[PDB]
Structure 1
Amino acid sequence: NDNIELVDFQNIMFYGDAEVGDNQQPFTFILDTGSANLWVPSVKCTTAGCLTKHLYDSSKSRTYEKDGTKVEMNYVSGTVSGFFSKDLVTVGNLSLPYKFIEVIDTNGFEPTYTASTFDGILGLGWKDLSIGSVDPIVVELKNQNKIENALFTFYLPVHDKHTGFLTIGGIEERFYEGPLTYEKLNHDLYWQITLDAHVGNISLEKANCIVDSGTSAITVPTDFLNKMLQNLDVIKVPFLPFYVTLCNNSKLPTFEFTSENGKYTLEPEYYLQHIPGLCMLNIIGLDFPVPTFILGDPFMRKYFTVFDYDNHSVGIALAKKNL
């Protein structure tokens, strides 16, 4: 299959490379199941941040198709803006002409953008999540008969153990062990499924759970989070929504998430980030109209995940500890 290497950056985040243009101009991406647009910064971007990145030049590519529709993308960390373009996009060994955003202004995305090592973002969500009604890249590959199955998988890197892969088009056995259970999407928007959630006696039945590679935390309803952390020797840190603890804290809880078909757990080792024997919890309280858990990178580090557009499902199995 088409494997894109996922490269750990100092155990903080992971990135993958892909190319744009028939001259294959190289970019580093966040590979984000929580979004659904592809963007790269343009040679026509002149902001401070752009001068530090790899840039796209439409003039150097023969397969460029103009669109020019203005567009702005909004993220938690800020906004980028520019215009739609179309060109050849190569992800590992596969390429296809594809619509994307050429970014001209990054000043509303700072300091994040200058302070990070990615050039752009490559969304892997569903069509209805995208600005511009862009068919997802994996769907388009399948439509243009370049892969048989419109699915992709994540096997995340683990610092100083092993690298990761985004695989497009088939499921490799080498990445997981135990049973692979598929959970049906509750909406074709995010990769969002319905699970019962428990920590000890704290529970939330039929929680909406979003599998988001673009987020390095588990997000939890604020009342659930408040209940789960009391009497634990975790310290809320003032002026910020973060929590610290002793790395060796034996009181720390395990999330359990269950469907009729599978049971998934996330122990403290997957959500603790070492920072003097002290660790931050990669868990954040967030309320939405549908009580939701965002199962970000800490969950995906434990569990290999399969994202299947043909079956409208997320497949979850234990990731193999080594490759």
Structure 2
Amino acid sequence: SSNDNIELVDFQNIMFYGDAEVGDNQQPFTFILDTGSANLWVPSVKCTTAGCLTKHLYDSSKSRTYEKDGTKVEMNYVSGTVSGFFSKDLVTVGNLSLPYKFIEVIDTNGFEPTYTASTFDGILGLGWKDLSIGSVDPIVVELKNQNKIENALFTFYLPVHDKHTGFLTIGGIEERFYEGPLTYEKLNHDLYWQITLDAHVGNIMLEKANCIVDSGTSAITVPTDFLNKMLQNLDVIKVPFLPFYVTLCNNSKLPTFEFTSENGKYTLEPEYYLQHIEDVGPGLCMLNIIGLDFPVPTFILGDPFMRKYFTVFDYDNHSVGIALAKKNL
């Protein structure tokens, strides 16, 4: 070894969590590690809302390195909102640590039912500074600026439920996690980990699509028009008014997503975007895809993409590295 690793455990076969600590007394929390945001938050002992009941809670009084701030702040995600106030304390990811500005959340009611239905405590953003609220330098950037890691990069190797755990690796790239070569794609903006790829599924093509690589999204997210055309004659049932797309798992018509650049070609076959729902009915699957429109046509390459492809998030070189993940360690 040489790089620091946070072990990742799957949540309900699609998302994944990892643990980190806040305070000089190493108060532990379970996090969604989220390349699609850029703020760290943990629920406070000062939380009053029902969603905090089952959570680990941060107690600033128990940490000598706590530094008061108290600036109020609301953190908004596509899926919900939490609010509280800024604080500063030692954040420990792996056995790397640094003083860090984060949000003590005291109100989680804007993040229900998700928060209560889930077993994470907080979210640890891994995006770029401009995506942050409160102008926070990213953890991995600060760590390299303070010379605590070799490279301002991190790496995701996602867990698979029955097979193996996953790792968030900070500071370096480990060959054990992927097969074949890494291909690098330059960021089109330092905001999300967003790259430009042609997106192809049917005879449907969206050239130069904005593709966000987002560990904190459980699905593949697709422009609504693209999705509608995708599903035309696919024998997929959209349950009226629900983003719930049901198919025979062995539906021969299900296409393969193909995202291409000059550098590389990344595909997502049905086996990666289908989720079994045998308890709903025999041989049934749902498409783990949703339609979502951004100002610019955008795909979120969420967990289903990252489950197939090992990913490198390189701040120094402003790029995402992609390689086929090893099926087994």
Shift of 1:228: 1.5
Deviation at 1:169, TM superposition (A): 0.3
More deviation in 279-288 or 87-96?
279-288
**How far does residue 247 in structure 1 lie from its aligned partner after superposition?**
1.1
Q: What is the CA deviation profile of residues 51-72 of structure 1, one whole-angstrom value per residue up to 9, with x for unaligned ones?
A: 2210001111011111110001
Q: Work out the CA distance in 2 between the residues paired with 1:85 and 1:21.
A: 11
8 Å Cα contact 2:7-2:168 kept in structure 1: yes
What residue is the counterpart of 2:56 in the other structure? Answer: 54
Name the counterpart of 1:35.
37
Unaligned runs of 5+ in 2: none
SS of residue paired to 2:142: helix
Structure-1 separation of matches of 2:54 and 2:218: 24
Distance 1:79 1:198 in 2: 33
CA separation in 2, counterparts of 1:221 and 1:111?
A: 25
Distance apart, 1:190 and its partner CA? 0.3
Offset of 1:179 from its aligned partner? 1.4
Determine the structure 2 residue equivalent to 1:25. 27
The farther-off stretch of 29-38 and 48-57 is 48-57
Corresponding residue number in structure 1 for 2:189: 187
Matched residue SS, 2:316: coil
- CA distance in 2 between counterparts of 1:259 and 1:78 reads 33
The Cα shift of 1:100 comes to: 0.1
Q: TM-score, normalised by structure 1?
A: 0.98
SS at match of 2:205: strand
Aligned length: 323
**Matches of 1:261 and 1:174, distance apart in 2:** 22
C-alpha separation in 1, matches of 2:79 and 2:206: 29
| C-alpha distance in structure 2 between counterparts of 1:107 and 1:226, whole Å | 33
Shift of 1:9: 2.1
Measure, in 1, the Cα distance between the counterparts of 2:224 and 2:113.
28
CA shift, 1:76, in A, is 2.4
Name the SS of the counterpart of 2:144 in structure 1: helix
Q: What does the per-residue CA deviation read over 1:121-178, in whole Å, with 9 as the maximum and x for residues that have no partner?
A: 0000000000000000000110111001000000001120111000000000000011
Please give the per-residue CA displacement for 1:105-130, whole angstroms capped at 9, x wherever unaligned.
11221221111100000000000000
Instruction: Output the CA distance in 2 between the equivalents of 1:51 and 1:221.
Output: 37
Deviation string, structure 1 residues 253-297 (Cα, Å, up to 9, x no partner)? 001111111111110000001113211101111222211111011
Contact 2:14 2:304 in 1 (8 A): no
Query: In structure 2, how many angstroms separate the alpha carbons of the residues matched to 1:201 and 1:310?
Result: 37
Range with greater deviation from structure 2 (238-247 or 262-271): 238-247
Q: Distance in 2 between matches of 1:62 and 1:24?
A: 11
Q: Give, in whole Å, the separation in 2 of the partners of 1:71 and 1:10.
A: 30
Instruction: List structure 1 segments (4+ residues) > 2 angstroms apart after TM superposition.
Output: none
* Greater displacement, 234-243 / 95-104: 234-243
Distance 1:76 1:182 in 2: 28
Structure 1 pair 149/23, CA: closer, same or farther in 2 (3 Å)?
same
Q: Report the TM-score when normalising by structure 2.
A: 0.96
Counterpart contact for 2:255–2:269, Cα < 8 Å: yes
Q: Quote the Cα distance in structure 1 between the aligned partners of 2:178 and 2:140.
A: 22
Distance (Å, rounded) in 1 between the aligned partners of 2:11 and 2:210: 30
Deviations 1:31-54 (A, max 9, x none): 000000000011111221212210
Deviates more, 1:233-242 or 1:32-41: 233-242
Question: Which of the residues 312, 315, 319 maps onto 1:313?
Answer: 319
> Which of 286, 296, 304 is the equivalent residue of 2:310?
304
* Aligned with residue 69 of structure 2, among 53, 67, 70: 67
- CA deviation digits over 1:75-129, x for unaligned, max 9? 2232111100000000011011100000111122122111110000000000000
Stretch of structure 1 that moved more, 108-117 or 209-218? 108-117
1:148 to 128, 147, 150: 150
CA positional deviation for 1:199: 1.3
RMSD: 0.9
Alpha carbons 2:14, 2:303 under 8 Å: kept: no
Q: Any idea what SS the aligned residue of 2:136 has?
A: coil
Corresponding residue to 2:285 among 264, 279, 282: 279
| Amino-acid identity (%) | 100
Q: Counterpart of 2:253 in 1: which secondary structure?
A: coil
Q: 2:265 & 2:128 partners in 1: Cα distance?
A: 25
Partner of 1:322: 328
C-alpha displacement of 1:222: 1.6
Supply the distance in 1 between the matched residues of 2:190 and 2:143 (Cα, whole angstroms).
18
- Relative distance call for 1:289 and 1:48 in structure 2 (3 A) is closer
How far off its partner does 1:248 sit? 1.3
Distance 1:101 1:174 in 2: 35
Between 1:103-112 and 1:82-91, the stretch displaced more is 103-112
